[PDB]
Amino acid sequence: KLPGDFGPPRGEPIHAVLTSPPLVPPPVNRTYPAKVIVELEVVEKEMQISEGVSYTFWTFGGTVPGSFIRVRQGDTVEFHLKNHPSSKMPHNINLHGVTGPGGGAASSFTAPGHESQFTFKALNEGIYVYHCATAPVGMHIANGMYGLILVEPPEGLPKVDHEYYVMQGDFYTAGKYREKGLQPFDMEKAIDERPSYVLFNGAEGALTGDKALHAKVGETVRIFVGNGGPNLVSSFHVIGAIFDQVRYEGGTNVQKNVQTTLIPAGGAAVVKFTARVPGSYVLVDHSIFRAFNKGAMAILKIDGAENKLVYSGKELDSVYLGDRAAPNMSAVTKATQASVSGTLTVQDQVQAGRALFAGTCSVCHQGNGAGLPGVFPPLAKSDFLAADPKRAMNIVLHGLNGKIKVNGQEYDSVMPPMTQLNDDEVANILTYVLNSWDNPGGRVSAEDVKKVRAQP
Amino acid sequence: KLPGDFGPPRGEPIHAVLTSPPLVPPPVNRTYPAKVIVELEVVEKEMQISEGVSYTFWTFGGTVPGSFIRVRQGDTVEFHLKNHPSSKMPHNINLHGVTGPGGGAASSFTAPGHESQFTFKALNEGIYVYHCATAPVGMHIANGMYGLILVEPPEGLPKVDHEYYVMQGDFYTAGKYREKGLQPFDMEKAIDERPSYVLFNGAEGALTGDKALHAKVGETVRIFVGNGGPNLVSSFHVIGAIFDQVRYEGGTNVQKNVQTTLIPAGGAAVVKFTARVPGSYVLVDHSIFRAFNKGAMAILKIDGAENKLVYSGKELDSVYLGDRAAPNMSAVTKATQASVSGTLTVQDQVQAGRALFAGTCSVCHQGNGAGLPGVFPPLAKSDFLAADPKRAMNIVLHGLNGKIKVNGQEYDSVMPPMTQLNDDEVANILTYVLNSWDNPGGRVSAEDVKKVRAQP
Amino acid sequence: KLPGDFGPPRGEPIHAVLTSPPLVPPPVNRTYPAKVIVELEVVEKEMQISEGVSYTFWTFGGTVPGSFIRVRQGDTVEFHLKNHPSSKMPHNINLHGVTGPGGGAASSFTAPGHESQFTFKALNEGIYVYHCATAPVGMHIANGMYGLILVEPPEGLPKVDHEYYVMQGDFYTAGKYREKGLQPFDMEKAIDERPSYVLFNGAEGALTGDKALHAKVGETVRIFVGNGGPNLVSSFHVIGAIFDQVRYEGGTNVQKNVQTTLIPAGGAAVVKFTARVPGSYVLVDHSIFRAFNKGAMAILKIDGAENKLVYSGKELDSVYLGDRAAPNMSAVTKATQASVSGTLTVQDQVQAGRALFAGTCSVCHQGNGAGLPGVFPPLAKSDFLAADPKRAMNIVLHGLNGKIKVNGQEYDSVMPPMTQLNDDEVANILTYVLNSWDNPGGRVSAEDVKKVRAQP
Ligand code: HEC
Ligand code: HEC
Ligand code: HEC
Ligand SMILES: O=N[O-]
Ligand SMILES: O=N[O-]
Numbered sequence A, B, C: 001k002l003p004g005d006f007g008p009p010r011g012e013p014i015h016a017v018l019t020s021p022p023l024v025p026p027p028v029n030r031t032y033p034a035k036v037i038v039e040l041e042v043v044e045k046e047m048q049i050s051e052g053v054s055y056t057f058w059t060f061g062g063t064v065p066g067s068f069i070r071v072r073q074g075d076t077v078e079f080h081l082k083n084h085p086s087s088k089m090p091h092n093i094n095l096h097g098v099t100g101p102g103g104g105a106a107s108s109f110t111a112p113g114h115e116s117q118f119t120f121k122a123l124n125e126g127i128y129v130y131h132c133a134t135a136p137v138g139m140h141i142a143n144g145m146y147g148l149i150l151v152e153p154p155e156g157l158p159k160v161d162h163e164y165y166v167m168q169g170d171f172y173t174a175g176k177y178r179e180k181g182l183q184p185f186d187m188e189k190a191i192d193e194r195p196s197y198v199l200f201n202g203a204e205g206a207l208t209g210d211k212a213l214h215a216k217v218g219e220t221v222r223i224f225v226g227n228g229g230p231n232l233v234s235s236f237h238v239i240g241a242i243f244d245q246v247r248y249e250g251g252t253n254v255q256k257n258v259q260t261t262l263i264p265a266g267g268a269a270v271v272k273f274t275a276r277v278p279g280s281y282v283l284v285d286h287s288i289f290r291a292f293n294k295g296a297m298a299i300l301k302i303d304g305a306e307n308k309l310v311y312s313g314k315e316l317d318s319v320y321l322g323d324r325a326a327p328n329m330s331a332v333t334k335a336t337q338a339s340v341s342g343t344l345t346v347q348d349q350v351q352a353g354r355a356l357f358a359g360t361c362s363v364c365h366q367g368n369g370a371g372l373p374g375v376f377p378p379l380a381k382s383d384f385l386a387a388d389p390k391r392a393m394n395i396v397l398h399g400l401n402g403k404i405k406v407n408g409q410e411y412d413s414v415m416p417p418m419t420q421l422n423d424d425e426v427a428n429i430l431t432y433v434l435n436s437w438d439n440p441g442g443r444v445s446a447e448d449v450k451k452v453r454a455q456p
């Protein structure tokens, strides 16, 4: 035979359940093959890739990753691709797991305002990436045109308590990481495989803080994990936990009891986790500068009873989660909007600075600015700061070392430079400091920082 | 014992069958261990890495990848490496799967005009990369000095209908992708792992168009897949199909039913495919900018009956294959030769432009230049073009957006910049357009494009 | 239950055995669960990353990688992290394999002069990376803050003759590869994943020459292999041998009989090797420019009887090991110290040049400078050199091609440029040549080379 030889479609056609990340459609829960009608529409739209940073995404179903598709092995799928009339570009679809030329791309070419259709049998069980395959293919994928399709085995997957949808992608902005405004696609960075962001589910903080995934102690969690690329291979890892199982695509091999696993560009895996201890468990790309400098972190938050026999210790997770430990960074979004409108207040800056100060400065100066006597000097009521508040701009951008004295105490240490911070970020952080802990007040502007950055 | 303990060589020595890519030597078809004499010669030679782009390759047996070697586990191999007297460099060989220092490299050091020999027992069954290991090793490998050796299990591999040889490599030219002429090796790009080309079998289009691999519906195909590197890891994938099996080197684990698989730098795998539906099936490195911007695409073309129950849809594959959908791009080769000779005609430019227009422009403007009314403006008999044919150079290089009117119709859309196109490519494409569809004619030269590219 | 449900700790607390690379603590050799007290101290210190190149490493226990920790699955581990008072930075620890938030990082935040403690049960058997997780996490890891923890299965691992500890890392210096002096961390290179060094065990030559690992023909060797990253994925490979087994972390799957294996950033594997033939077996990252241009090579040296039936050939391994074939390159270290002190002699330069000449020049000009008549011209008593010893600086930096005559013999070949050599390296190499083989003598200085490099 062929694989997936389960008989002809039976019953009425089914109009398929699509879901937006991070949710999954329900199990199909049937024992017969069906004709499944899938309707998916392309929408090109601006969304926030980071706080105060807009990007023109190209999407399947209005999200990155695109809508999740769920069918049964042996189903006949009638696929309808619509391209919204607001689109500027033509689009198509290639579904991994399809048996046929281009995985559909050859038959789904769709101009703005049009619709295409093609039909395929799902022979191949597994989790599979789908993506646009319109020239230039790389640009389409880089702009967010990918998602997952699950083809269930005929008996269905084993029951779990939660199923989630998480997809990594690499993104290429003309501006640098966290540079505000509408950021165009940068073809030069893309060709060179030098992304400015590496993200889960299309944005920094998409799955952190108040947007974390949830489960309880004792529960099992399945995550359908994709890597849309376009270019990067993920050293996919869960901090502080282990995967009971990892299965790639439709593969017969299943790895068990691993914590770090390589997902190819265009690859997908199903992972399973059992919650044992409460807290935040972090999904990262363990090519570590991606996770901690470019946005590649997502959270699964577990609630329930402690188990001190398994893990007994403090819970100070801002030291690595940094500015993503908090529920959100909406103050940054708001300050950026106000700056664009020309209505930025001191308090707007202060609250944005407060959000950014977490991790970035607090790891050494503490959340209250007290420092640690003799080791990290205070920012709280700092005579050194007050003596020349402007010099703080140079200190942040270019670091500080050597002997200094602060609130009558000697320091001889090293503060690394932080030149990667953008002008608004430095301004906002310093404005927060100046207006906290009985410091002199005032404000620093982005334009002030720009001038200091530019001196030799 | 050791592994491969099958007895002493029997019979007469065998003088081994070497083959050029993409073919494989026949199965050894024997039940006893032999002494196998291998003779392989290094040749340094210019070949075309892309149409009109020459490169000085360093080769084992005159090809990239080098000649395929096939032996049986337990054989004693007497290896003779010759370095042709025309070579400028010394060379040697390291065969993965050899048990001994340097995999042979230590004993096969061979100056131009000389020959070396060493003997090894093939203890280890599997598919293995071989490559040069002469300082600087990276430069030798980057210049094309790698291939595969198969060491069969004693009972032989299972019968299939076709066996093919495909090897990925990353290449480092001083010039940019598709910049014409003889391109030197670029050490700086190589150290930084920033290749200009990523190719199967040593050239763009080596396995596309009229050079595709072939099979029929129902047939099984084994591909011996290598990654010579030097630096890249391939997210190796078949578009529109699945691998029945993937086996790395001589490993005991075999993965089944996967579509995307990671091949390490210096790694090799045996994959198996069963043809089910007619059409072109694309082998790519799914770090997508490699596949679609740097040459990393190869084709397996399947002929036979349609199976509409499995796949039913149109077959417009130029939308992703682009300029590699056609049998070849020989017009580009020819135009480049003519340009070098100072005998480039308008028609030379037109035919080269026609080849490059596929995908690159046709995805939006159509193959006939008609566009799509209101969405993509026409190039065919375009008043906007005719009004200022020179401005077309800026449109290609730097894009166009905003309200415009063309053949009495309003457009308000976005044409992305295409700055990665080389000066000759832009010139040739525009010359094609000007001389097609009752457009005004004339020509654009590479020197014209160069001037426009250089303005602020 | 949970996994690792073996009963409560019994007996007295055990104060755990830590070891420095490349050694491993002994097998725990017990059949009951224990309370294990681990004491690990962070020390920030300058060490030599390469000969004459210093770097400020941040370390767990004074080494890179950090001290190896060995416990039994089911143990309760009381972990004490001390941060030495000389440290400038705060630090913490995340142990992969820990079940709990941050793998401990959340509870081990430790300022200079302080100590922290947290307790965890080792539920998960396997080899696991541990690393610092203090913001900015990437900088901490890049500076060398990683190591391995082994959690044994309850019955212990199978007996082998040797166990070794090898950990890859990528490093980011402001200066270029082999540029002398104290090299700061370079954040820009790190974010871009463009390392200047890629090393085993924290330094070039850490495991080469007289620092190689050892075993004998017939013996089995287990290596606990880590990849600390921060960013790179290793195409981990043994030259001239094969791995009997490769097992990732605590995974249930075990691959057998492979030579090349991908280790994720933050990943760890246990590999097993059986010595069959004498010689040097090279562990590399087979992204080849890492192994041969950035330091990613380590040696296992096997002593014992030859087996000519398995491998019969010469042993000229300087052709690929290059300057790492010799016991060390201490002459380079010494010349650099002398240069810094202003006491650099001609002989200091000569001996440093001699060390660097191996591979770099000897592959073509031979170890004795004789060249090969008609193919590679002589450096020994070279009239061409003597005629204009200064022009040798341009020859090394920028190459030489075309017809030339040397000791009354015609050459028409190509010497590639070697611009990646640093000014001191070129100076020292040429000083060696001038003072060898009855050449005219004199010296070339680094400042001379600097001037020539800077001309147009
Ligand atoms: C890794 C530790 C660390 C981080 C992170 C850090 N600092 Fe510092 N900072 C120091 C140390 C140590 C000094 C003292 C340097 C010396 O001894 O020369 C210092 C000095 C200062 C000073 C001048 C002395 C004083 O107390 O007024 C200012 C202002 C300052 N830091 C602000 C910041 C701000 C704002 C941030 C975040 C953008 C930040 N620092 C991040 C460690 C750090
Ligand atoms: C992704 C879609 C797309 C691709 C690919 C594309 N174009 Fe365009 N092109 C457009 C659109 C849309 C416009 C109109 C822009 C506007 O509305 O401001 C345009 C405008 C033009 C115009 C001016 C208007 C006219 O009709 O004369 C020329 C000339 C042109 N394109 C040529 C090319 C050539 C040649 C190529 C390939 C090198 C190309 N274009 C590739 C979409 C595209
Ligand atoms: C890959 C081969 C190769 C390597 C490696 C190499 N050379 Fe050469 N070298 C040549 C060849 C061939 C020529 C002659 C070029 C010609 O024919 O135009 C040459 C020429 C020379 C000459 C001038 C002719 C003479 O004999 O005096 C000098 C000096 C020289 N090399 C020094 C060096 C030094 C020092 C190194 C290492 C830093 C080095 N070369 C590395 C091959 C090499
Ligand atoms: O556990 N590493 O981020
Ligand atoms: O199926 N991806 O090119």
Ligand SMILES: O=N[O-]
Residues within 6 Å of the ligand: B094, B096, B103, B266, C237, C238, C239, C240, C284, C286
């Ligand atoms: O065997 N490769 O270096």
Ligand SMILES: [Cu+2]
Residues within 6 Å of the ligand: A058, A089, A090, A091, A092, A132, A133, A134, A140, A145
């Ligand atoms: Cu698209």
Ligand SMILES: [Cu+2]
Residues within 6 Å of the ligand: A094, A096, A131, A266, B286
């Ligand atoms: Cu794909």
Ligand SMILES: [Cu+2]
Residues within 6 Å of the ligand: B058, B089, B090, B091, B092, B132, B133, B134, B140, B145
């Ligand atoms: Cu070679």
Ligand SMILES: [Cu+2]
Residues within 6 Å of the ligand: B094, B096, B131, B266, C286
């Ligand atoms: Cu190799």
Ligand SMILES: [Cu+2]
Residues within 6 Å of the ligand: C058, C089, C090, C091, C092, C132, C133, C134, C140, C145
């Ligand atoms: Cu640290």
Ligand SMILES: [Cu+2]
Residues within 6 Å of the ligand: A286, C094, C096, C131, C266
């Ligand atoms: Cu980690």
